[PDB]
């Protein structure tokens, strides 16, 4: 038997959408599936207060840089999300990618017919569809996950998971009056509390680990800059190709001790005042290989929270002791630490005294109790595999994908694994292209197995595996590099349990052996 299409593309996220672009462009046969009602991915599902990009919007605009939509005008360097989900509701104008999808449906299973070498996807737990292959774009940070809280349902106020605000008016923004309580402070939680604040009652926060946060410094674009921007596409988008993370940063070449308490202390200041992640991934070459050198680090963003929060136990309560700086994702904020100086606003500290269970009222805690009128939970999410473990996918010897993952991933370049045939994850787990500015690197990601597809197209191939010792060898280098950094003394949404979830080395790198594979006739994989 025959499948019906070339490939089934699974969301409709930035990726989601660029993927089946390229694939219809080539003139293939292709359906796109997103679970919501339109395109967005990220930008369609995160609407609370504050939700803002972490990347300059320039760098994260493939789209545009590609000329796509070259036009598109950005009005600050960090776009909110209503913004971002305007860029990408153009983009797919100019794509005219919408009549490829079903919206409103949700994969749930996913089955390997070895005897036909195809997938019987399956929509919303009855119809099933067939593809030559299965392209999951379904994005690492989908997948909300509720805290592991006792009587969750037990209350009687508002509440609700960040990503599934009240609605597309996101609605109930002023807090005028209410008694309103925050779980988590990561990056999330950090972009809510300081707006929340501003018209809430009360605000609580419980705040069970704290991280390293740094000044945004967003500020609006003028048109002569936004101007002398696009006239520098071609660099910018050359540029953002040859950094590490595809941000528009790169180290210094010096290490952290090569330079004077002095020197040092003067070039952190300049970063720290610098708009977005500079501080980040401009530090010394070092900042994340070395104790020393990060330590410096730390305890210059340290000094820095001890300023601007007033009272100095509730600044002690917010400085991490527990994991090197830039370890887990480094939030970037509006005005958070001085959230605290208000008086309308207590940190509450839950590793000292854990969360006991959420009651009607609001929520009790091994000291305490607090009655709440909303409660906020930014608990974050099933980071990289989550999404995917939430379809029954299914390969050779009926293997589950969960059970094939049980030790941890398994994947040759992070884009296949093992038993389940002509099967691409994008932007999955082992991943360079997880690691990223992912608006340019799951683009490049795009791209290059559209090249696989079209290879197999052209040879008449029906059928691309990893071999054992190819993915068993990726999967050895991507924690053996993993091992190597400061990045191991932390619990990011990257780790799972203490192993990585991700690829960690440069996305150039990573980029450069896909290509050494591609050329060499895709070499690793077994093709039929
Ligand atoms: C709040 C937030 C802010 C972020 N900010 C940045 C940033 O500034 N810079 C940066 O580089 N990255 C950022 N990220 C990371 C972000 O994941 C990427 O930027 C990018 O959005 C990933 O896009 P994607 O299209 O690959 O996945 P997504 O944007 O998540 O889209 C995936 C889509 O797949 C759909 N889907 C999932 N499962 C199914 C199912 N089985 N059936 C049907 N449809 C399904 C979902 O509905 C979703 O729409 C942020 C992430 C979050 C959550
Ligand atoms: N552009 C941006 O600036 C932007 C904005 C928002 C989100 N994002 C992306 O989304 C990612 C996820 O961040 P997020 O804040 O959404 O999630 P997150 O980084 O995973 O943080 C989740 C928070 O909830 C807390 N938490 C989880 N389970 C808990 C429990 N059982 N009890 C008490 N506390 C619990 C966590 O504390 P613990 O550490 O103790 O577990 C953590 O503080 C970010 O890393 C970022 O890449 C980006």
Redesign the pocket.
């Known amino acids: 038997k025959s499948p019906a299409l070339d490939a089934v593309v699974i969301g409709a996220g930035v990726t989601g959408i660029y993927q089946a672009f390229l694939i219809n462009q080539a003139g293939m046969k292709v359906l796109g599936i997103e679970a919501g009602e339109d395109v967005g991915g990220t930008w369609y599902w995160n609407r609370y207060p504050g939700?803002?990009?972490?990347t300059e919007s320039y760098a994260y605009g493939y789209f545009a840089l590609k000329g796509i939509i070259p036009e598109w005008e950005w009005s600050e360097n960090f776009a909110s999300q209503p913004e971002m989900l305007r860029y990408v509701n153009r983009a797919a104008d100019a794509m005219d990618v919408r009549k490829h999808y079903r919206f409103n449906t949700r994969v749930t299973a996913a089955r390997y017919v070895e005897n036909d070498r195809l997938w019987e996807v399956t929509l919303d737990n009855e119809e099933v569809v067939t593809c030559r292959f299965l392209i999951s774009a379904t994005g690492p940070?989908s997948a909300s996950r509720m805290?592991?809280?006792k009587g969750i349902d037990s209350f009687k106020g508002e509440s609700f998971h960040?990503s599934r605000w009240p609605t597309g008016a996101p609605k109930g923004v002023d807090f005028t009056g209410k008694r309103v309580g925050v779980?988590?402070?990561?990056?999330?939680?950090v972009?809510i509390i300081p707006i929340a604040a501003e018209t809430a009652k009360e605000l609580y926060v419980?705040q069970?680990?704290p991280n390293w946060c740094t000044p945004l410094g967003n500020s609006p674009m003028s048109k002569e800059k936004m101007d002398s921007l696009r006239n520098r596409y071609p660099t910018i988008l050359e540029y953002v190709k040859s950094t590490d993370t595809a941000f528009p940063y790169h180290r210094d070449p010096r290490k952290g001790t090569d330079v004077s308490e002095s020197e040092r202390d003067a070039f952190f200041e300049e970063l720290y005042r610098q708009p977005g992640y500079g501080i980040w991934l401009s530090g010394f070459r070092d900042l994340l290989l070395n104790k020393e050198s990060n330590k410096f680090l730390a305890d210059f963003v340290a000094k820095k929270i001890r300023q601007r929060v007033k009272d100095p136990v509730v600044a002690e309560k917010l400085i991490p002791k527990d994991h090197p700086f830039g370890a887990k994702?480094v939030?970037?904020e509006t005005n958070y630490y001085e959230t605290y100086n208000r008086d309308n606003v207590h940190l509450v500290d839950?590793r000292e005294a854990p969360?006991q269970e959420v009651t009607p009222e609001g929520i009790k805690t091994a000291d305490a109790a607090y009655d709440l009128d909303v409660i906020i939970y930014?608990?974050?999410?099933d980071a990289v595999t989550g999404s995917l473990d939430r379809i029954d996918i299914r390969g050779k010897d009926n293997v589950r994908l969960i059970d094939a993952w049980a030790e941890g991933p398994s994947t040759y370049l992070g884009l296949q694994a093992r038993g389940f045939p002509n099967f691409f994850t994008l932007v999955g787990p082992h991943n360079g292209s997880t690691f990223c500015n992912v608006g340019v690197c799951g683009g490049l990601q795009a791209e290059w197995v559209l090249r696989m597809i079209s290879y197999m197209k052209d040879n008449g191939f029906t059928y691309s595996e990893p071999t054992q010792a190819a993915e068993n060898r990726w999967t050895e280098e991507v924690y053996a590099d993993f091992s190597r950094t400061l990045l191991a003394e932390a619990?990011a949404?990257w780790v799972k349990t203490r192993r990585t979830l991700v690829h960690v080395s440069g996305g150039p790198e990573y980029r450069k052996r896909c290509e050494q594979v591609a050329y060499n006739n895709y070499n690793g994989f077994e093709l039929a």
């Not at 779980?183 to 999330?188: F, L, R, V």
């Not at 930014?378 to 999410?381: L, M, Q, V």
């Open positions: 939700c803002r990009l972490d940070l805290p592991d809280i960040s779980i988590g402070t990561g990056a999330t939680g972009q419980f069970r680990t994702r939030p970037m839950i969360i930014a608990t974050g999410f619990n949404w």
